[PDB]
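Support case: calcium ion complex. Customer-provided input:
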Amino acid sequence: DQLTEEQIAEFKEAFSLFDKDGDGTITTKELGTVMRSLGQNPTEAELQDMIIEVDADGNGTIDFPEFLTMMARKMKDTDSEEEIREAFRVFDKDGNGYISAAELRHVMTNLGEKLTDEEVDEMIREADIDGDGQVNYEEFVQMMTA
Amino acid sequence: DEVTVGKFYATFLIQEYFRKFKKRKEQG
Ligand SMILES: [Ca+2]
Ligand SMILES: [Ca+2]
Ligand SMILES: [Ca+2]
Ligand SMILES: [Ca+2]
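Agent response - structure generated as follows:
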């Protein structure tokens, strides 16, 4: 139940990715723009569905308290395998089952915290168990569970 | 539910991975 100041800051940083204009609410339009920047192409009906599921009052947008309520509860879910696969799909935008340095760099630039190109190479190398220069799904699961 | 919630939580998990990586690398 207990949330730390650091956990709240982490959830705030996740919220700020979707609130493109920084005005305090996530709109359906912003959600679509961010999803497409992460290589996905949701339908307008899917976008409206996602807003409605998080929007606790009726006003049609997501504010941070609504976002935090959903994320703090998700922190107590046990389906870790499904969440890690969703993260894998964010990186693996071409769906070939392997994350390249270029795919990692692309996600990095969209999500905020900057990594140098040397750090991108290092992150790939340290997860690349079999040494083909890319991160497959089973390597990614081990990376994300450490 | 898990489909919608999962997209938002996935970006958190990725941001956390990057943040922990950078913090550990620069640990004094
Ligand atoms: Ca906004
Ligand atoms: Ca609302
Ligand atoms: Ca790929
Ligand atoms: Ca590999």
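The radius of gyration of chain A is 16 Å.

Case will auto-close in a few days if no follow-up is received.
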